[PDB]
Amino acid sequence: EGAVAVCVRVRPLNAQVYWKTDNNVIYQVDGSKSFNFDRVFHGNETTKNVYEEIAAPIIDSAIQGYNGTIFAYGQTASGKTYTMMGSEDHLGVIPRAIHDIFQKIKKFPDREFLLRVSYMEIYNETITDLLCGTQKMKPLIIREDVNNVYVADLTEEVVYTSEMALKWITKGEKSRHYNQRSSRSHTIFRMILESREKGSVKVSHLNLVDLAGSERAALKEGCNINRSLFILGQVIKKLSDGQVGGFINYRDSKLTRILQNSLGGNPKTRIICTITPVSFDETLTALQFASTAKYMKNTPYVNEVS
Numbered sequence: 422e423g424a425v426a427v428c429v430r431v432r433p434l435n436a437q438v439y440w441k442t443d444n445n446v447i448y449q450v451d452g453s454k455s456f457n458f459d460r461v462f463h464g465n466e467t468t469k470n471v472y473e474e475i476a477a478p479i480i481d482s483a484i485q486g487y488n489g490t491i492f493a494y495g496q497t498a499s500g501k502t503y504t505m506m507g508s509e510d511h512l513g514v515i516p517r518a519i520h521d522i523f524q525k526i527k528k529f530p531d532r533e534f535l536l537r538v539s540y541m542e543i544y545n546e547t548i549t550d551l552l553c554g555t556q557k558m559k560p561l562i563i564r565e566d567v568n569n570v571y572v573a574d575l576t577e578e579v580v581y582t583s584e585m586a587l588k589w590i591t592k593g594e595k596s597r598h599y600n601q602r603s604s605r606s607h608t609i610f611r612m613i614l615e616s617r618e619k620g621s622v623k624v625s626h627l628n629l630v631d632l633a634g635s636e637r638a639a640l641k642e643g644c645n646i647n648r649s650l651f652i653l654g655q656v657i658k659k660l661s662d663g664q665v666g667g668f669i670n671y672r673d674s675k676l677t678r679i680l681q682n683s684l685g686g687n688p689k690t691r692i693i694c695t696i697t698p699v700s701f702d703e704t705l706t707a708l709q710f711a712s713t714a715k716y717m718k719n720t721p722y723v724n725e726v727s
């Protein structure tokens with residue numbers, strides 16, 4: 422199978438170091454806690470390495486008509502945005518995916534490709550489109566179609582070049598820029614890839630998700646709670662325990678309902694758990710989440726339509 426995979430990414434130091442990594446084990450220093458993952462990336466490993474090992478195979482699967490979802494999960498300042506968006510000197514998984522897709526579809530001259538992108542924010546259970554004007558930004562509504570959840574009136578932009586796809590991301594990014602909001606917000610970058618022979622059509626949704634900071638993941642109000650992250654935890658816990666169907670409260674948050682198909686459903690899902698080794702409690706919560714997520718079972722197939 423290998424439909425679900427989890428890795429951890431330790432950020433380098435910018436205070437006791439509470440965590441160290443020995444191969445693919447993250448262990449508490451002079452402590453009892455340890456967690457095995459399929460891959461742990463150390464402070465000196467690059468977003469290029471993370472992209473190539475974790476994301477590249479999902480981009481390959483997307484071009485073959487599999488749904489694919491990549492999440493960055495972890496504490497504020499742990500590396501989520503560094504990993505998923507990055508900068509000119511060190512591109513994130515999202516810009517790398519876009520370059521990668523446009524370079525890789527050229528290896529299929531037998532096939533016609535149509536690509537379009539959407540970019541949305543979820544903040545305090547409100548969905549906003551990041552690609553329309555600031556004027557046109559309003560709370561959007563999750564609806565179902567003839568079969569599948571969608572975000573009603575979410576801009577979809579056709580893109581023929583990486584340059585135009587990256588111009589849409591830049592636009593959305595200055596709109597995300599528009600107090601401590603981006604650390605409490607989820608962002609979903611989506612590419613819908615359609616292809617056919619140059620005639621059934623392969624349709625895949627590639628979702629690349631930068632989550633709200635897990636400090637607010639999790640029974641009183643000593644401090645703050647993000648509903649989407651709490652429900653994400655709950656949904657993944659229920660799936661990993663072997664439950665299915667109406668037991669699974671996808672509808673309790675915008676995030677879990679939008680990405681319901683990424684959590685036990687039709688796609689290939691990867692979680693990149695980002696951690697700062699100078700954090701104890703927030704790192705521990707993130708590694709428990711990540712560890713639970715390893716045992717989530719997805720059933721992905723090629724999406725070919727009439």
Ligand SMILES: Nc1ncnc2c1ncn2[C@@H]1O[C@H](COP(=O)(O)OP(=O)(O)O)[C@@H](O)[C@H]1O
Nearest residue numbers: 431432433496497498499500501502503504604
């Ligand atoms: N792997 C890394 N290597 C170098 N700098 C990093 C790395 N991960 C994070 N940083 C830096 O640490 C800071 C916090 O990272 P950021 O991705 O903004 O965190 P988050 O989005 O999870 O809140 C930023 O200045 C970022 O560039």
Ligand SMILES: [Mg+2]
Nearest residue numbers: 501502603604
């Ligand atoms: Mg961030």
